[PDB]
Write a protein that binds this ligand. Structure first.
Ligand SMILES: Cc1cc(S(=O)(=O)C2CC3(CCN(CC4CCN(c5ccc6c(c5F)n(C)c(=O)n6[C@@H]5CCC(=O)NC5=O)CC4)CC3)C2)ccc1Nc1ncc2ccc(=O)n(C3CCCC3)c2n1
Ligand SMILES: [Zn+2]
Lengths: 382, 298, 276, 822
């Protein structure tokens, strides 16, 4: 239904605290450059570029390493551990700190940090520092931007009518089914020179795939306008990738897709092929389906949050879930979504912690109840 | 605010965050509730203004004392008095052998005095749950977290509909009654009294209809004979299943006759004939009241 | 003396509720010479500001209790200040109402709405600042017995049938609006602050009732209110000559609650006749 | 893989044409560039005389003639697509003609992305500079000074990032560019001045004018008119600063005007053409004659006739117009003054052959006289045809008036199965009506598919009047008379994609198996299609079996007596049962869409547009497909082909061809699973279809390909010794042979992509090696000086420059002989 929640709070991570420093800095790296980068040992997250990762660090060397890595650069290597969880990391992502905070209060160090992923790398070596710190010597993978499929076969006399007037307002009659039908007939007119039809080349068109993905992205938490979902296909693909509830082995394969075109095709592939999200270690219960998936934040249906003990959870927000029982009573402590209280949810068969049930606690709040299901206990299906 | 030194996080109430701090001047332990006004678009939240305004007018041995209020830029601090625990953690720590009947007597007797003090001051707590009843090692239980409180007028008018936690929500509030009054708090105390004896929640429902059906199953389906006007209540439907007044001898075993009568009065369906706090303090159950000292490891 | 106007009570006992109400009346001090501390100000712009607040309440369907809470907040906040200009006055006024809003009605209008009502003269940050310093200056003592709450009490004690039943509203809806209309007309001038709020409501009740209904309902005696009645004469009169209004209806409000909403029609036009 | 690539037929699709005084100071010359060959004709009253033809190491993207001050002839400016430019001059010394490179250089920028609208090259009228629009946001100027022999150029920032078109204006003291561009609130036209001594942009002599939303052609009108003419979908407008004059005739509404030409030096009238292939004349009548000035009065346009879909137009004086086409045969026609034979003023009087967009060819031979016939599906739309190439070179054209997509040959029935597509319009009364009578509508016998298994009945979506629909037919064409003997029309919204003619299982009948996809404008990916088996027996075409599939049958092939087809992303092996039915036997599921799919022996090679190529094997006694290898890097792939059991050859973006190898080393079960690339080469052509067969009879194998630009090429395989010998010869020839524009052969044949560029490896250029016989004896003696031919056993060092002649001449006769221009 309607959502007057002001979905910016989940992205703000206000539960992490108040007096948080807000580094405006940025940094990059040359393509296929061998870099030596520090590693966080306890985070098991598979970070996708453009994703916000909040972390709470307790261990002394970790406090020290974040403290000394704040000044010289701000990047650390979140390795995407394979199914073999201990070591055996072949690829990963670089994350740069954009918010850092230190409180000696209560007599414990605790470093509260918010980072965001920038690049992807392959790890060629993994050395160990003097104090239980992993240094990954890595090579940056390339962002291979692919030219248009008619840039080679193209009549230069027709290459002058290849710009198109403009977008036809926003979702009107004879403005979605008609404008795209004339866009496909004018951008792929040289497809008659090749051995394939226009509708085949539309399947590999960045604009068409982005529009087709946005058609489904609107069903989850109808979008205000194209302010989100950047026009650049690389950024759009990385943003959509962070929202798919697929498991870890599929996420690794998606993160290895070099081109944006193949990444969009794979995301659009697992957007209608998937039918049901089911219990992972239990494998029998039908928890939810796609139809009840909705986004409560600008980041999308799924985002990364952190419990007071430092663990990072990818919580997918759904309207309705079944085969789950609640343990305990609602509490508003450290709540990821401000104004809601959580109750621990476990599956009916194997009593495995699957997520939480959030309920409204303040006055005049539109979604009276929803469910946040952790991704580590979900296995998408047929 | 440079005099207090934080020691540990306690928890979060209806709003803000509560810490434990020791005053460096007199060396006493207090609690500090913190509000971040910079995030609050509507300045100081309504709950904050309400609780601060009511808490400086209520001074009772069984209501948590508001020692001092300050404002340090973009932060609001309320200093409270320190209580060592809450009722819930004490009940959980005593889920095997349990709270003695004299201790339950003293706890309910002391809650009723604070509730009667609030009701004499035309104040509706509306948040009587075991998290908000704080106990100490001296054997005193006190009311806390007045954020959801409201000073009801004379006459009353319509206030906020869905109030109180679901497990402690009165049936008239569930049925969408137009006007509610003091009786709701009494109901909560009953729901807590039976909780102190049976050791689990009396009505553990995860939805409105559930809660209502569980209340009916325990106490029977109301009619116009016991509760005038149920058939005319906005949320009452004729399809409600007919259950018949499960005997209190099985619902709440370990307590005797006068306790059973008092609890049945505390769980009466109609607000008009539901027992008032003062007329509950006159019950024979409070004839041999004492003040035992709980031993509360952890 | 105030013997015991209120009947026997069930949810509490009558004596305690009554002495608590009287001690609340005693605790909140109000001064009719609070304007002399500010030589630039005059009673007329206080009346103008109160009327503007009345209009603001009427626009947003805020309750009468909200308006009178704002009035008490203003009249107690000015008495603790010195040498304020009229330009600030509007802000202070809205701030009081803004605070009063959060205290009384279920769904406050948002801060941006309150800023928009000021027509750009006051901003949201300014409103929050002034509300915070108001809450300091009143020492967070923000629960007074207003003029209209006393009127509600008196009206219920006026019309009682099956004893008790003091919490469920039961009284005609046109006498209440007439008496409140007299009370806000008497609220614009400063010297009304001389008399207690309960005495104000009682005398305004009498000016549309008999001398025995007042005494049965209010617990008061003739001498303590002779001055109040003698002073109110003009008000009651100008109102009687003008003719009382009718219980108007509001959108989104039940027909049994419309009498608890502020209705501003015209006051300054009658005050000058009253002061003549 | 030690390959050898040569061209058996030069490109025939003309991509640019220009006229001017190139050969001498007074004769009129026609210069036509097709892909890489520049052909110079001297136009005479009889027609065209082919004086010269040169070949360049690059794809001519822009070419114009210009005569700078103090010059007797016209100089030629050529910019190739690798972004290198050259200024050339014709000279003749008695009886020898060569193209001097007056200037040359490389123009590309280190950082920058190629513009979407494409390379635009313009030359200052009076020749003060050359303007190039190559990358978005910047316009680069080459000053045409007498000392800029290295073509040094500087870039001026363009504020408008989306520039549609740009031209140089006439009659301006400082050079002016008028350009139409787009901003996110409209499409505008505005001018700029170029300052060379200070190298920036100054305010132009007009005002920023808001123009038609589909304006796409700016042409510069010469004196005494001046100004510019803007041509778009709706109207033709004329701007000359203050003066504005627009007309919106209904005659040009049907099609989009794409090409234009100026047929009068005064600029009084122009020639233009559109996509549909009809020709208009744009008349500008002075009719003003003021006190001292002449201005425009109206801008009427008129129909002239129909020609071949035209890519370029030029006026060759005395009524004759050359129409250069990339989709069909080029034309040389004549515009009569008052012909009106039926309404058309144009009559064709010469046609130049154009193999065009070869989309699919087949090699047909039974007797070995020349042991070769190349039947290619050429052209598109009105001029789609099939071309039969024989060596006796005889090119025979069979016009279909519809686009041909796939062709396959049946020996027993002596017929060709041709997939064809026809464009129809939606009528008001409901139904499809044809534009022109095509081969599908003029067949001896006709049939329409009556399949009822495709009930569908899910949002039929009756289209709008004027919508374009595409009907697909299968044509049975005789192989002796080339007469369409049968046309079978497929169902509505059915795109025919694949066609094979092969025997299946244990029956002796040969079949035409076609794969189809039901395409709907809302469904991006087809979810239903058919596999249909036809028999052409004694005149008719009977459907023997029909099979439902849940997706598009992109490609399929006969495989050891079975079929194997690609349904979306699954590869399915069907076995043709005894009761004339097709039953599934094997399934494999891939992460990529199986577009290209070729088998040899028991190996299958699949691939998609994204160059990700997979290689599977069929295990006989287990009953499925086992993945052997697969290499996946993102790039656009046009065609793939399996050379031998180990080497696989494909064509990829930027007109490149590659060969990837299999196995070798085989260290740890991952080396053999990796398809490591071995060879790269820059063809310069977009190869479209890639088949086997020899067309004429030290090279083993012969795989020939057909491209978009009309080229036909042949790639064979050599050995270690001969690859080394010819690679050594290739470098020695590069130091003796001088190209047109001083373009290095290594740079021109370097594998190119706008992310990377590496030298060509594993490929030997047949054209450069065959150019050894066109060199002189004293120059031939420097190539072979310190060589080591080696044959019997000894290197015999010298090689005598007569032995390598024998080697190259033996290499020459593996393909057809190129006819001499003149
Ligand atoms: C002295 C004294 C002691 C106790 S006590 O000990 O009884 C109490 C301490 C307690 C409070 C609750 N935590 C239990 C922990 C359980 C784990 N956790 C948590 C939270 C989120 C989690 C999570 C977790 F694990 N995980 C695994 C997750 O993944 N998430 C995510 C997060 C995001 C989300 O959205 N979803 C999720 O799931 C919270 C802490 C400590 C134990 C109980 C009571 C009172 C006092 N004294 C005292 N004196 C004076 C006053 C005066 C005024 C006043 O108001 N108060 C009190 C303030 C509050 C009530 C009244 C006073 N109080
Ligand atoms: Zn389970």
């Amino acid at each position: 239904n309607i959502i007057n929640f002001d979905t910016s709070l989940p992205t703000s991570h206000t539960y992490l605290g108040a007096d948080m420093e807000e580094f405006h800095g940025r940094t990059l790296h040359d393509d296929d450059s061998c870099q030596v980068i520090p590693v966080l040992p306890q985070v098991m997250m598979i970070l996708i570029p453009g994703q916000t990762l909040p972390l709470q660090l307790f261990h002394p060397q970790e406090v020290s390493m974040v403290r000394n890595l704040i000044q010289k650069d701000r990047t650390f290597a979140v390795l995407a551990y394979s199914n073999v969880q201990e070591r055996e990391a072949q690829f990963g992502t670089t994350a740069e700190i954009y918010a850092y905070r230190e409180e000696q209060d209560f007599g414990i160090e605790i470093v509260k940090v918010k980072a965001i992923g920038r690049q992807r790398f392959k790890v060629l070596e993994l050395r160990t520092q003097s104090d239980g710190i992993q240094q990954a010597k890595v090579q940056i993978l390339p962002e291979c931007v692919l030219p248009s499929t008619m840039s080679a076969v193209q009549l230069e006399s027709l290459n002058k009518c290849q710009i198109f007037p403009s977008k036809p307002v926003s979702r009107e009659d004879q403005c979605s089914y008609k404008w795209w039908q004339k866009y496909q007939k004018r951008k792929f007119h040289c497809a008659n020179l090749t051995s394939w039809p226009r509708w085949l080349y539309s399947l590999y068109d960045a604009e068409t795939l982005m529009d087709r993905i946005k058609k489904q992205l609107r069903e989850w938490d109808e979008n205000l306008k194209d302010d989100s979902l950047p026009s650049n296909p690389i950024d759009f693909s990385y943003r959509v990738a962070a929202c798919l509830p697929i498991d870890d082995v599929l996420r690794i394969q998606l993160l290895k897709i070099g081109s944006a075109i193949q990444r969009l095709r794979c995301e659009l592939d697992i957007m209608n092929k998937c039918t049901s999200l089911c219990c992972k270690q239990c494998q029998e219960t039908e928890i939810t389906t796609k139809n009840e998936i909705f986004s409560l934040s600008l980041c999308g249906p799924m985002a990364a949050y952190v419990n007071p003990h430092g663990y990072v959870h990818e919580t997918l927000t759904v309207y309705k879930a079944c085969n789950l029982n609640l343990i305990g009573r609602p509490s508003t402590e450290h709540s990821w979504f401000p104004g809601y209280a959580w109750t621990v949810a476990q599956c009916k068969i194997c009593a495995s912690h699957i997520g939480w049930k959030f309920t409204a606690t303040k006055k005049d709040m539109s979604p009276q109840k929803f469910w946040g299901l952790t991704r580590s206990a979900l296995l998408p299906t047929i | 605010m440079e005099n207090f030194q934080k020691v540990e996080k306690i928890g979060e109430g209806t709003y803000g965050v509560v810490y434990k701090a020791r005053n460096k001047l007199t060396g006493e332990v207090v609690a500090l509730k913190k509000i971040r006004l910079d995030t609050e678009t509507e300045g100081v939240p309504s709950t904050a203004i309400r609780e601060i305004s009511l808490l400086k007018e209520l001074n009772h041995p069984n209501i948590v004392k508001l020692l001092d209020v300050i404002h340090t830029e973009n932060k609001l601090y309320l200093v409270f008095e320190f209580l060592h625990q809450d009722l819930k953690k004490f009940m959980d720590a005593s889920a095997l052998t349990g709270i003695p009947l004299p201790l339950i007597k003293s706890y309910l007797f002391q809650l009723l005095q604070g509730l009667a003090f609030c009701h004499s001051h035309r104040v509706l707590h509306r948040d009587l749950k075991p998290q908000n009843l704080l106990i100490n090692t001296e054997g005193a239980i006190k009311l806390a977290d007045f954020g959801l409180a409201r000073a009801f007028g004379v006459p009353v008018r319509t206030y906020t509909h869905e109030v109180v936690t679901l497990w402690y929500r009165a049936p008239e509030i569930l049925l969408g009654c137009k006007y509610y009054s003091t009786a709701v708090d009494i109901w909560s105390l009953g729901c807590i009294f039976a909780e102190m004896v049976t050791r689990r929640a009396l009505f553990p429902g995860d939805s409105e209809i559930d809660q209502l059906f569980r209340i009916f199953r325990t106490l029977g389906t109301p009619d116009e004979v016991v509760w005038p006007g149920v058939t005319s209540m906005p949320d009452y439907k004729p399809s409600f299943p007919k259950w018949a007044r499960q005997d209190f001898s099985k619902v709440v075993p370990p307590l005797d006759e006068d306790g059973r009568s008092l609890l049945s009065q505390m769980l009466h369906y109609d607000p008009n004939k539901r027992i008032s706090a003062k007329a509950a303090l006159a019950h024979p159950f409070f004839q041999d009241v004492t003040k035992p000292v709980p031993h509360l490891r952890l | 003396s105030r013997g015991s106007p209120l009947p026997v009570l069930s949810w509490a006992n009558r004596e305690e509720v009554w002495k608590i109400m009287l001690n609340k009346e005693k605790t909140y001090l109000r001064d009719q010479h609070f304007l002399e501390q500010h030589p630039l100000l005059q009673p007329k712009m206080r009346a103008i500001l109160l009327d503007w607040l009345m209009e603001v309440c009427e626009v947003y369907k805020l309750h009468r209790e909200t308006f009178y809470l704002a009035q008490d907040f203003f009249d107690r906040y000015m008495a603790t200040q010195e040498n304020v200009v009229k330009t600030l006055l509007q802000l202070i006024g809205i701030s009081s109402l803004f605070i009063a809003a959060k205290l009384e009605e279920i769904y406050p209008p948002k801060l941006h709405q309150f800023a928009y009502v000021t027509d750009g003269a006051c901003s949201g940050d300014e409103i929050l600042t002034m509300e915070l310093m108001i809450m300091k200056a009143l020492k967070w003592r923000l629960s007074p017995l207003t003029i209209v709450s006393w009127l509600n009490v008196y009206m219920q004690v006026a019309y009682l049938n099956d004893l008790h039943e003091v919490l469920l509203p039961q009284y005609p809806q046109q006498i209440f609006i007439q008496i409140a209309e007299l009370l806000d007309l008497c609220v614009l001038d400063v010297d009304c602050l001389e008399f207690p709020y309960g005495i104000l409501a009682a005398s305004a009740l009498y000016h549309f009732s008999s001398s025995e209904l007042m005494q049965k309902v209010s617990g008061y005696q003739w001498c303590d209110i002779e001055n109040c009645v003698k002073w109110m004469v003009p008000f009651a009169m100008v109102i009687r000559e003008t003719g009382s209004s009718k219980l108007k209806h509001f959108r989104g409000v039940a027909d049994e609650d419309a009498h608890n909403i502020q209705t501003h029609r015209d006051s300054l036009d009658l005050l000058d006749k009253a002061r003549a | 893989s030690y390959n050898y690539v040569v061209t058996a037929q030069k490109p025939t699709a003309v991509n640019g044409c220009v006229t001017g005084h190139f050969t001498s100071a007074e004769d009129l010359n026609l210069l036509i560039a097709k892909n890489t060959r520049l052909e110079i004709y001297v136009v005479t009253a009889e027609g065209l005389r082919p004086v010269k033809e040169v070949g360049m190491y690059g794809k001519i993207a822009v070419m114009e003639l210009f005569r700078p001050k103090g010059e007797s002839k016209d100089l030629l400016f050529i910019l190739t697509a690798k972004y290198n430019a050259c200024i050339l001059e014709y000279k003749q010394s008695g009886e020898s003609i060569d193209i001097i490179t007056r200037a040359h250089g490389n123009v590309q920028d280190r950082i920058g992305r190629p513009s979407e609208t494409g390379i635009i090259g313009i030359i200052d009228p009076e020749c003060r500079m050359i303007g190039l629009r190559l990358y978005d946001g910047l316009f680069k100027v080459i000053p045409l000074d007498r000392d800029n022999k290295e073509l040094k150029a500087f870039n001026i920032r363009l504020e408008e990032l989306h520039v549609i078109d740009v031209k140089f204006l006439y009659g301006c003291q400082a050079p002016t560019i008028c350009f139409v561009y787009q901003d996110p609130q409209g499409r505008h036209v505005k001018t700029y001045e170029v300052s060379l001594r200070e190298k920036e942009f100054n305010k132009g002599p007009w005002k920023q004018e808001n123009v038609e939303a589909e304006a796409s052609m700016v042409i510069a009108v010469p004196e005494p008119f001046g100004g510019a003419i803007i041509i778009g979908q709706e109207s033709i407008t004329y701007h000359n600063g203050d003066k504005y004059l627009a007309i919106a005739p209904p005659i040009i509404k049907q099609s989009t005007i794409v090409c234009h030409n100026r047929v009068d030096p005064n600029g009084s009238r122009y020639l233009l053409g559109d996509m549909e292939g009809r020709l208009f004349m744009l008349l500008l009548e002075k009719e003003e004659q003021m006190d001292g000035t002449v201005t425009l009065k109206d801008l009427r346009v008129e129909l002239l006739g129909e020609t071949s879909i035209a890519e370029c137009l030029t006026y060759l004086d005395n009524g004759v117009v050359f129409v250069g086409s990339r989709l069909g045969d080029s034309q040389l026609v004549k515009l009569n003054v008052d012909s009106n034979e039926q309404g058309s003023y144009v009559v064709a009087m010469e046609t130049f052959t154009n193999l065009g967009p070869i989309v699919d060819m087949c090699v047909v031979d039974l007797e070995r006289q020349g042991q070769g016939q190349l039947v290619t599906c050429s052209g598109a739309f009105k001029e789609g045809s099939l071309r039969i190439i024989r060596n006796g070179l005889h090119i025979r054209t069979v016009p279909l008036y519809e686009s041909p997509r796939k062709i396959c040959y049946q020996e027993v029935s002596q017929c060709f199965g041709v997939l064809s597509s026809r464009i129809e319009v939606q009528d008001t009364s409901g139904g499809t009506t044809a534009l022109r009578p095509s081969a599908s509508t003029q067949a001896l016998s006709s049939s329409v598919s009556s399949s009822k298994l495709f009930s569908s009945s899910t949002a039929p979506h009756e289209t709008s009047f004027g919508e374009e629909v595409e009907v697909h037919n299968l044509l049975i064409i005789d192989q002796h008379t080339f007469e369409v003997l049968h046309a079978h029309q497929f169902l509505q919204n059915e795109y025919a994609l694949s066609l094979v003619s092969c025997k299946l299982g244990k029956d002796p009948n040969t079949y035409f198996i076609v794969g189809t996809a039901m395409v709907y404008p809302e469904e991006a990916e087809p979810k239903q299609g058919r596999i249909v088996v036809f028999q052409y027996s004694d005149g008719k075409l009977q459907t023997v079996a029909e099979k439902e599939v849940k997706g598009a049958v992109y490609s399929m092939v006969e495989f050891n007596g079975k079929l194997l087809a690609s349904i979306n992303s699954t590869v399915r092996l069907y076995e043709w049962t005894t009761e004339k039915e097709l039953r599934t036997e094997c399934n494999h599921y891939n992460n990529i869409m199986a577009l290209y799919l070729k088998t040899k022996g028991d190996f299958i090679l699949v691939g998609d547009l994204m160059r990700s190529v997979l290689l599977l094997a069929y295990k006989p006694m287990e009953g499925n497909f086992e993945e052997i290898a697969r290499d996946f890097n993102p790039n656009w792939m046009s065609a793939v082909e399996i050379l031998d059991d180990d080497n696989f050859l494909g064509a990829e973006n930027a007109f490149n061809l590659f060969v990837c190898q299999k196995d070798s080393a085989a260290t740890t079960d991952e080396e053999r699973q990796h398809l490591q690339e071995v060879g790269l080469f820059h063809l310069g052509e977009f190869v479209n279809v890639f088949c086997h067969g020899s067309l004429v009879m030290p090279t083993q194998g012969s795989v020939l390909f057909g491209t978009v630009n009309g080229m036909i090429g042949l790639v064979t395989s050599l050995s270690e010794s001969w690859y080394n010998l010819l690679l050594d010869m290739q470098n020695r020839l590069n130091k003796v042979i001088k190209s047109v524009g001083k373009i290095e052969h290594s740079f021109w044949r370097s594998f190119h992509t706008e992310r990377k560029t590496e030298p060509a490896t594993g490929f030997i250029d047949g054209d450069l090696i065959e150019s050894f016989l066109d060199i002189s004896r004293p120059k031939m003696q420097e190539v072979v000086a310190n060589l080591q031919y080696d044959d019997g056993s000894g290197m015999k060092r010298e090689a005598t420059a007569d032995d390598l002649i024998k080697v190259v001449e033996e290499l020459t006769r593996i393909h057809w002989s190129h006819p001499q221009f003149e």
